[PDB]
């Protein structure tokens, strides 16, 4: 264990739980303890800016848009797998949400370190993540439903 990240639903504004971040010899483990999520597989990524506030795009509101794009320190400008290097370092494996709307399945990011995560935002999307920009950009994650700033 190490860091505790408070997550909040963007649409409702109410807290949905926390995610514990820990560093180990194989990378960063994300241990979720969230509730009230839509059952299924969800896009899960680290974003650039440390904010969950809404942004604005061509006259339309973007929930959690202030977080910016996917954390991409090497400027790959591509969405990929958590085990591939030529893509966003913030690409995490998808988060599993069971029928009861709970997310407790831990996940690991081999290309990340805890230290570099400080000041960034953890994002959970409505759609899944096929780890590619096609047929849909950013793995088809779609809108941002839950978000939290890494302290």
Closer to its own copies by CB, 109 or 123: give it: 109
Could you tell which of its own copies, Zn ion, Cu ion, none binds residue 123, using a CB distance below 5 to 8 A set by kind?
A: Cu ion
Q: Is 70 annotated as a binding residue?
A: yes
47 appears as a binding residue in the annotation:
yes
Q: Applying CB under 5 A, does 52 fall inside the site for Cu ion?
A: no
User: What count of Cα atoms within 13 Å lies in the side-chain half-sphere of residue 91?
Assistant: 28
The answer to the question of whether 131 is labelled as a binding residue is no
| CB of 70 vs Zn ion, minimal distance in Å | 3
- d(CA 28, CA 139) in angstroms, rounded, equals 21
Pairwise CA distance, residues 82 & 87, whole Å: 9
Tell me if 75 is assigned to a ligand binding site: no
Q: Per CB under 5 A, does 79 bind Zn ion?
A: yes
* Interface of this chain with Zn ion, residues 82 to 101, rule: CB under 5 A: 88, 91
DSSP class of 4: E
User: What residues between 91 and 150 interact with its own copies by CB under 8 A?
Assistant: 93-94, 96, 98-99, 105-108, 110-111, 131
Q: Output the six-digit token pair for 51.
A: 């904010």
Q: Is 26 in the site for its own copies (CB under 8 A)?
A: yes
Q: How far apart, in whole angstroms, are the C-alpha atoms of residue 132 and residue 99?
A: 26
The Cα 110–Cα 102 span in angstroms is: 24
- Kindly give, in sequence order, each residue whose CB lies less than 8 Å from that of residue 1, ignoring residues fewer than 6 positions away: 20, 22, 31
79 interacts with, out of Cu ion, its own copies, Zn ion, none, CB within 5 to 8 A per kind: Zn ion
Residues that bind Cu ion (CB under 5 A): 45, 123
């Amino acid at each position: 264990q190490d860091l505790t990240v408070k997550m909040t639903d963007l649409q409702t504004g109410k807290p949905v739980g926390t995610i514990e971040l820990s560093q180990n010899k194989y990378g960063v483990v994300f241990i979720p303890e969230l509730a009230d999520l839509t059952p299924g597989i969800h896009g899960f990524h680290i974003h650039q800016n440390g904010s969950c506030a809404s942004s604005e795009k061509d006259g339309k509101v973007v929930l959690g848009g202030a977080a910016g794009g996917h954390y991409d320190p090497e400027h790959t400008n591509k969405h990929g797998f958590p085990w591939t290097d030529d893509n966003h370092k913030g690409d995490l494996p998808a988060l599993f949400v069971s029928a009861n709307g709970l997310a407790t399945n831990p996940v690991l990011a081999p290309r990340l370190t805890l230290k570099e995560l400080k000041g960034h935002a953890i994002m959970i999307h409505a759609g899944g993540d096929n780890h590619s920009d096609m047929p849909k950009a950013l793995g088809g994650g779609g809108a941002r439903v839950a978000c939290g700033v890494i302290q």
